[PDB]
Every structure is written in C-alpha cells, then in structure tokens.
C-alpha cells in the first residue's frame, strides 16, 4: 500500500450515494471482483450490488412513476421499504470490501493507511509516520522508526 497517511472516514451511505462516480464505477467494481475470485470465494454481494446499480444507471434520466394520493400511504411505505432493502444490500457489500481488503493486506505484508485495523496483526489502529507524534486515538506516544507488523524476511 502506497497511501499511508491519516484519513477521513465517510459514513457508508454517503459513499454509496456516489453511484456510478465511485461506488459503482465499473473499473473499481471489477478489481474488487478480482480479489474475491482469486481468493476462491463467490462474489454474491458484489453481484447484487452490480445488478441494483446497473439498473439505477440505465433509468437515471427518467421521471419517477406518477403518484396517486392515498390515506393508507402503502405506496410510499413500499417504495421506502424497497429502498432501504437496497441500501442494506449495499452496506453488506461495502463491509465485505473493507473486510477482505484488510485481511488480504494482512497476508501480503502490506501496511495500511494510518489509524487502520488489521484483525490479526494491528488490533488498535496501525500507525507509523503521522504528522502528529502520538497515536491519534490511543493518545500513546509513537516509536521511531515506524512500528513493524511483520517478521523481517521477504
């Protein structure tokens, strides 16, 4: 991993709201798929996501279907329910990506960006060479040189 510096975390929903621009950008989604496939694990959530989003993109310039007014509000609530389903289908994916990426990085002897967990290796966030001399969230002092997660041979 080349990008090492401390970062700003964005809530999952705003990441998903980027649609085609980032979250569903074809290019990105394909190399996620590559990671999964190479690990020998089906990519179902990715495929659900890709389906939902593919279709989002196809109809993205159309006006929504005409609404008739109801005291029930069954329509509004069914649209909502469907929507939060899709949101959750994608939360699951977003989680999977962060999960597997961290795990794979643990196998590749990769050091993550500052303040990032790698389950077996760095439990509290890993940090080295931050702009700030302490670990940001522990409030503990950082050693020089940067802490090493892996034994030396390569």
């Amino acid at each position: 991993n080349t990008f090492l510096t401390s970062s700003v975390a964005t809530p999952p929903i705003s990441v998903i709201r980027t649609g085609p621009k980032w979250w569903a950008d074809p290019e990105r989604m394909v190399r996620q798929k590559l990671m999964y496939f190479t690990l020998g694990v089906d990519q179902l959530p990715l495929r659900r996501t890709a389906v939902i989003q593919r279709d989002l993109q196809r109809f993205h310039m159309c006006k929504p279907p005409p609404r008739v007014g109801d005291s029930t509000g069954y329509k509004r609530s069914r649209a909502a329910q469907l929507n939060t389903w899709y949101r959750r289908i994608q939360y699951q994916e977003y989680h999977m990506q962060h999960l597997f990426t961290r795990h794979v990085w643990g196998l590749l002897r990769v050091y993550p960006g500052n303040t990032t967990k790698i389950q077996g290796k760095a439990d509290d966030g890993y940090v080295g060479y931050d702009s700030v001399p302490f670990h940001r969230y522990n409030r503990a002092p950082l050693p020089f040189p940067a802490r090493e997660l892996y034994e030396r041979r390569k």
């Binding site: 389906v51 939902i52 279709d55 159309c62 929504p64 279907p65 649209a79």
Partner: protein, 44 residues
C-alpha cells in the same frame, strides 16, 4: 397486416412494448425472510 405496419411498427417503442419508462423500478427481487422490527439501534 400491411407491409408498412410490419416495416415501421414492429419495433419496441414507448408505444408498442416499452422497457420501463420510469425511474425507481424494481431492479432486484429475491425470496427472503422478513427482518425484525426496528433492527437499527437509535444512536448518539
């Protein structure tokens, strides 16, 4: 039918058999169980 009808009218259009003309349609359906009521914790 008229050869004209079968030359010009035998294609998919918003008249004939349109693909959905509207936003926010159902992309993905599956057979699944229902989740618990209010699975989300109210927070912070």
């Amino acid at each position: 039918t008229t050869a004209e009808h079968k030359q010009q009218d035998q294609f998919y259009s918003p008249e004939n058999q349109p693909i959905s003309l509207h936003r926010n349609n159902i992309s993905y359906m599956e057979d699944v169980g229902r989740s618990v009521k209010n699975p989300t914790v109210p927070g912070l």
